[PDB]
Design a protein around this ligand. Sequence first.
Ligand SMILES: Cc1cc2nc3c(=O)[nH]c(=O)nc-3n(C[C@H](O)[C@H](O)[C@H](O)COP(=O)(O)OP(=O)(O)OC[C@H]3O[C@@H](n4cnc5c(N)ncnc54)[C@H](O)[C@@H]3O)c2cc1C
Ligand SMILES: Cc1cc2nc3c(=O)[nH]c(=O)nc-3n(C[C@H](O)[C@H](O)[C@H](O)COP(=O)(O)OP(=O)(O)OC[C@H]3O[C@@H](n4cnc5c(N)ncnc54)[C@H](O)[C@@H]3O)c2cc1C
Ligand SMILES: COC1=CC(=O)c2c(c(COc3ccc([N+](=O)[O-])cc3)c(C)n2C)C1=O
Ligand SMILES: COC1=CC(=O)c2c(c(COc3ccc([N+](=O)[O-])cc3)c(C)n2C)C1=O
Lengths: 272, 271
Amino acid sequence: GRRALIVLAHSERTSFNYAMKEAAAAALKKKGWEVVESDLYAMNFNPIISRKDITGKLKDPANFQYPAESVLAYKEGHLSPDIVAEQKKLEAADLVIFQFPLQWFGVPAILKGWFERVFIGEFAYTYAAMYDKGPFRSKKAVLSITTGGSGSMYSLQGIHGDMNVILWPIQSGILHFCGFQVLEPQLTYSIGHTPADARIQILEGWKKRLENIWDETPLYFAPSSLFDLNFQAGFLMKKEVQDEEKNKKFGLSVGHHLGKSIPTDNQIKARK
Amino acid sequence: RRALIVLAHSERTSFNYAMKEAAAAALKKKGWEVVESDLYAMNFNPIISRKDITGKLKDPANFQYPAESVLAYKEGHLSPDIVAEQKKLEAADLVIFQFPLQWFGVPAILKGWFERVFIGEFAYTYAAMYDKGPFRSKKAVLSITTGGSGSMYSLQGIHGDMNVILWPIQSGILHFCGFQVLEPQLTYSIGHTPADARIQILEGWKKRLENIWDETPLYFAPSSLFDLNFQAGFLMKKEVQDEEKNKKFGLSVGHHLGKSIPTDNQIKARK
Ligand SMILES: Cc1cc2nc3c(=O)[nH]c(=O)nc-3n(C[C@H](O)[C@H](O)[C@H](O)COP(=O)(O)OP(=O)(O)OC[C@H]3O[C@@H](n4cnc5c(N)ncnc54)[C@H](O)[C@@H]3O)c2cc1C
Ligand SMILES: Cc1cc2nc3c(=O)[nH]c(=O)nc-3n(C[C@H](O)[C@H](O)[C@H](O)COP(=O)(O)OP(=O)(O)OC[C@H]3O[C@@H](n4cnc5c(N)ncnc54)[C@H](O)[C@@H]3O)c2cc1C
Ligand SMILES: COC1=CC(=O)c2c(c(COc3ccc([N+](=O)[O-])cc3)c(C)n2C)C1=O
Ligand SMILES: COC1=CC(=O)c2c(c(COc3ccc([N+](=O)[O-])cc3)c(C)n2C)C1=O
C-alpha cells in the first residue's frame, strides 16, 4: 500500500511512455496504493523559473536572486500556487516514479523545469541536512527511462559511454541530494526497435516489479557521514575515511570514484 | 570569425549576464562578429511539441518528434523561432553557453533550446555521430557559475567529481553533434566571492577569449575506435579493446572502461 506519485514527461498519450505510466498506475492501485499523477504536458506545466514563482513582494526586487526569494516565499507561504500544488503531491507521496524518454542524455526540459521550480530550498533540501539526511529521506524514487539507442551503445564499450555516468547527475545530484533513497532505474532501451510482443512483456515486467518495489534495496551512494559537512573543511571526506580508502581497489560511486575503478553498475544495480 | 553566445538567465543584473557582456565586448574588440541568444529575453519556448512543425505531419495519429522534426527540417516546415536559431548556429564558428549550474546541469530553458534546435539531419546523423558530426568545424564552450564551492566538486567533495557532471552535456550533446569542446570556464561559489574578485573573474574570462580559438580541445574517444553499426552494436573495435586492456586509465569519463578516469578529462585538455 502507501501513496505513489507518477511524474510523466511525454506529450503523446499514444507513446510507450504513456503506456508505461498507465501500467504503473494499474499495477500499484491493484496492490492497494493510492496513485497520484503529474502528467506535465497534460497539465501544460510551466517549466521556466522566474520571479513570478513568488506571489508576494520580494525581499530585494531590484537584485532578484531565485534561491533566496523562492525559499523565503516557501517559508512565508507565497509561492505560486501551481508550484505549491506539486509540492503537496510530493509531500503526500511515499514512492515517486519519473517516467520519461531520455532526451539529449538527460531528462526532458519540462521535467528539468519541474525540478527547478518544485524542489525549492527548505522544502526539498537543506544545506544543513544534505543527501541521506534530506527532507525526502523517508521516500523512495525511481527513474523509468525509455531510450532510442540500444543497450550496447550505453555499455562500457559503447559509443555513447556508460549509462551509469549519465544517470549520476540525476539520481545523485537531484534525487539523493534531497534525501531520496533511489531505487534501480527501469531502463527500456531502443523502444523504437522493439517487437510488439517484446513491448508487451516490457509493460508486464514493469507491473511485475512494482508489486514488491518498496522492499527493494536502494542504489548505493557514499553516506554523508563520510564527509566534513562544514565550510572551512570544504565538504571533503573526513581525514580518517580518506586514509582507510587508500588501500581499497574500488572507488565508492560514479561521482566518488576517487580516481579509482567505479563499482560495476553503481547507478543501475542496487546490490552494493 | 563569428561567435554565438547563448545565455540562460532571467536577470539582467546577474553575474551570468555580466559574463555574457564581457564575452561580447572581448570578442568584438578582437574583430569577432558577435550574435546573441538571450533565451529569457527572446521569450523562448523550451518545450518540444508538434507545434514545432508548421507543415503537414506525415502521421498525426502517432506523433513521433524525431521523424517529424527531421522531415520538417528537410521540407522547410520548422517553426520560425527554431529556424532563426539554426541559422545563428550555421553561421557561428564559436558557440559560448553561459549559464548558472541548476540541479547539476543546464537550466530547463537551455535544455529545451537543445531539444528544439538540435534537430536530426541538421545537428547530427546516426551515420556521422561525434567526430563526423555537422558541427565538426565549430567549437563550443561552457561558461558555468555555481553556488557550491570548488572543493564540493572535487574527487573528495560531497557532490562528487564535476567531470562526471559535465560529461552528459559536453559529450552527449556538444560532441555528439561534432563540436570540438573547449575547456569549460568554471566559476565556483560566485555568491561568496568578494566584489574585487568578481572583477578579476570577468577580466580573466576576457583575456582567455583573446586566444580561445587556438586552444587545445577536450579529449573524447574518436569514432574510429568503434564499429559504427548495429551488426557490431556500436562497441569498441576488438583490436582497441585488447590494445586498451594494458592501459591504466580509461579513455574518458564516459569510456572509463571500468578503470581509472583520466584526471579532469572533461575540464582540462590532454589527449
Ligand atoms: C529531443 C529528443 C532528444 C533525444 N535524445 C536521445 C538521447 O540522448 N539518447 C537516446 O538514446 N535517445 C534519445 N531520443 C530518443 C527517445 O529517447 C525515444 O524516441 C523515446 O524514448 C521513445 O519513447 P516513446 O514513449 O516516445 O515511444 P514511441 O516512439 O511512441 O514508441 C512506442 C512504440 O511502442 C508502441 N506502443 C505504444 N503504446 C503501446 C502499448 N500500450 N503497448 C504496446 N506497444 C505500444 C508504439 O506504437 C511504438 O512502436 C531523443 C528524442 C527526442 C525527441
Ligand atoms: C533552480 C536552481 C538550481 C540550482 N542548482 C545548483 C546546483 O546543482 N549546484 C550549484 O552549485 N549551484 C546551484 N544553483 C546555484 C546557482 O548556480 C547560483 O545561484 C548561480 O550560479 C549564481 O549566478 P548568478 O549569475 O545568478 O549570479 P548572482 O547571484 O546574481 O550573483 C552575482 C554576484 O555578482 C554581482 N555582480 C553582478 N553583475 C556584476 C558585474 N558586472 N561585475 C561584478 N559583480 C557583479 C552581484 O551583485 C552578486 O553579488 C541553483 C540555483 C537555482 C535557482
Ligand atoms: C528517434 O531516435 C533518436 C532520436 C534522437 O534525437 C536522438 C537519438 C540519439 C541516440 O540514439 C541512437 C540510436 C541509433 C543510432 N544509430 O547509429 O542508428 C544513433 C543514435 C541521440 C543522441 N539523439 C539526439 C535517437 O536515437
Ligand atoms: C544560492 O545557492 C544555491 C542555490 C541552490 O538552489 C542550490 C545550491 C546547491 C549546492 O551549492 C551549495 C553551496 C553552499 C552550501 N552550503 O554549505 O551552505 C550547500 C550547497 C544546490 C544543489 N542547489 C539546489 C546553491 O548553492
